[PDB]
Amino acid sequence: ERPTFYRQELNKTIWEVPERYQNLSPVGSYGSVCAAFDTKTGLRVAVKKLSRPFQSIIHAKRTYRELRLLKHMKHENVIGLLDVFTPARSLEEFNDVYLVTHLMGADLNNIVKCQKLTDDHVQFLIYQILRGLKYIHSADIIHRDLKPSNLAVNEDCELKILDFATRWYRAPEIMLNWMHYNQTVDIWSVGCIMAELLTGRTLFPGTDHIDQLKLILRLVGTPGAELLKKISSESARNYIQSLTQMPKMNFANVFIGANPLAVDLLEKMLVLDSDKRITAAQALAHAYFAQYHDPDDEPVADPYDQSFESRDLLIDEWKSLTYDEVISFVPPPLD
């Protein structure tokens, strides 16, 4: 039996949500999100209505992707799905997708864009990012877009990773347009984020992709022989070979007065060579997180089937696949 939907118009768009969700109140804008009271759980929630979810092949697949990813995430430091619904009674009329998650208090952009943080605070927030990242990465998922505005924190300092300049946090292999980057592109982002929390300033505020690399190389130094031998694009190789050789900065001179353990972790995160960059699992056991690290409570994820990413299908097939996933959704445990 379907719940009772009620209809209302919120600013620019119509919303049709079960009666269970009350006091919809826009929080901003892929789609738009409202804060709501959820009568069944007693919780404040975020309800996102996807805009034009099935309007092109790209939208339809993206819609499918978002639903698949959210349904999979079950970890304290990663956003999870409370609910997913459509007002449609059948596939034929299936046109709208709404997703429901915990309402989070603020993003990390806010916490930093107002005050500097304590070292104890950065410890706990970086710890939590790494713990969520271990989990995400263990599923062979790469976030790819980690930045302060994608990290939600509530008043208790509890942190969750979500997906809602990017270039400022982006690993240099991606800047250089490498096709074969790994999971540690996210570690690079975590490094830029941590640096920003410790100093109150964007570590690498590039105006564009070239400026961005210039700023990066200025701290980390131009690639040595060992890394240059791994660069398969000639114009890329010859770009970095054509710049003036920059030496590696000592990070203790750069992050002066910061906890030396934090400086050390940063040294291990902000490595040009992605093969030598610390992983999330490794970083968790770094001395800097001594007061939080518990090797028996840093879980990995169930295997995640992303074989769909390589499929080329019709809009109606992505739509049908999305509908299946709506239908089979099992709400998480209440306790």
Ligand SMILES: Nc1ccc2c(NC3CC3)nc(-c3ccccc3)nc2c1
């Ligand atoms: N094992 C690795 C480690 C780092 C790499 C990297 N990093 C860029 C210097 C920052 N870039 C590239 C690459 C190859 C072809 C075209 C564009 C980029 N490959 C890398 C392979």
Ligand SMILES: O=C(Nc1ccccc1)c1cccnc1
């Ligand atoms: O974007 C948010 N939640 C959300 C994320 C993905 C799907 C549905 C909802 C959000 C917004 C503001 C506070 N907390 C979560």
